[PDB]
Amino acid sequence: TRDYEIQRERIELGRCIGEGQFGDVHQGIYMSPENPALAVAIKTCKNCTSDSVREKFLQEALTMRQFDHPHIVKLIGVITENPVWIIMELCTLGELRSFLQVRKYSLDLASLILYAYQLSTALAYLESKRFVHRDIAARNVLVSSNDCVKLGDFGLSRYMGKLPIKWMAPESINFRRFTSASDVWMFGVCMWEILMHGVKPFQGVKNNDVIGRIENGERLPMPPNCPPTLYSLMTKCWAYDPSRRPRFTELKAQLSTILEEEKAQ
Ligand SMILES: CNS(=O)(=O)c1ccc(Nc2ncc(C(F)(F)F)c(N[C@@H]3CCC[C@H]3N(C)C)n2)cc1
Numbered sequence: 001t002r003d004y005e006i007q008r009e010r011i012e013l014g015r016c017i018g019e020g021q022f023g024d025v026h027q028g029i030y031m032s033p034e035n036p037a038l039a040v041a042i043k044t045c046k047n048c049t050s051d052s053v054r055e056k057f058l059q060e061a062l063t064m065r066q067f068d069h070p071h072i073v074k075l076i077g078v079i080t081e082n083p084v085w086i087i088m089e090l091c092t093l094g095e096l097r098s099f100l101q102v103r104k105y106s107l108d109l110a111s112l113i114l115y116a117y118q119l120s121t122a123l124a125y126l127e128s129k130r131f132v133h134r135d136i137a138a139r140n141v142l143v144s145s146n147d148c149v150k151l152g153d154f155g156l157s158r159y160m161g162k163l164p165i166k167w168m169a170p171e172s173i174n175f176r177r178f179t180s181a182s183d184v185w186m187f188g189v190c191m192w193e194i195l196m197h198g199v200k201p202f203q204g205v206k207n208n209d210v211i212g213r214i215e216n217g218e219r220l221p222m223p224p225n226c227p228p229t230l231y232s233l234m235t236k237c238w239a240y241d242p243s244r245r246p247r248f249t250e251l252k253a254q255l256s257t258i259l260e261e262e263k264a265q
Contacts, residue, residue, distance in 0.1 A: 188237025
């Protein structure tokens with residue numbers, strides 16, 4: 001059985017790398033008991049002296065302990081004594097949206113397709129574990145290296161806060177139905193975000209008006225330079241009827257073909 005509780009004396013806290021919902025997040029080192037020292041992200045919790053806040057903070061770490069996939073951020077462990085910390089693997093290049101925005105004129109198309117392919121393998125793995133992510137968006141993706149992205153936020157995930165309406169499948173908005181097919185819809189939006197270099201979907205459109213546009217058959221437009229076969233795949237993720245959406249295993253196979261076709265120019 002994997003380690004869950006880890007010793008604070010084995011963590012060296014480094015620089016602050018941003019803010020989380022419960023408190024600041026720092027970069028650091030985990031001095032692994034039998035392996036080399038690992039670079040980690042240490043999530044801190046400001047009010048975790050309250051066991052009620054501690055329970056909410058640790059809920060995501062409980063979910064993460066069940067996963068082991070190369071394109072899903074790894075939980076290293078937690079420290080339940082005050083101050084409560086969640087120790088994740090560090091993805092050195094940070095948040096996907098910022099990374100793509102900064103490199104909009106330098107990242108080749110094959111890298112953007114590779115990120116979408118890697119994410120489809122992580123979502124097929126989640127489906128195989130009976131989890132619905134419910135929050136698939138570029139903001140929840142992290143960059144380990146130029147050729148490796150990882151799904152890193154599991155706050156809304158469920159073993160089967162403001163709603164991300166602009167990413168949600170119509171049956172999720174209308175009936176609170178969350179399935180692997182509704183994750184496919186969200187993944188289509190996340191692929192659109194990657195191909196748009198981190199631009200958000202439906203900018204300047206009110207959340208309450210998104211519903212109407214989707215219901216009327218309106219969809220996110222073809223990103224400039226997106227291969228037509230890839231945009232067609234995105235539109236299939238946005239079929240109104242969830243039964244007409246592709247499955248994650250089909251998305252993975254089709255993205256592999258699209259990636260291969262781009263690498264051969
Ligand atoms: C390059 N920019 S940076 O600010 O230096 C940086 C910014 C993050 C990172 N890696 C990194 N690796 C892992 C995690 C996580 F904790 F596992 F999620 C992480 N989380 C981010 C840090 C606080 C905000 C949160 N995001 C996802 C909202 N971050 C490495 C460097």
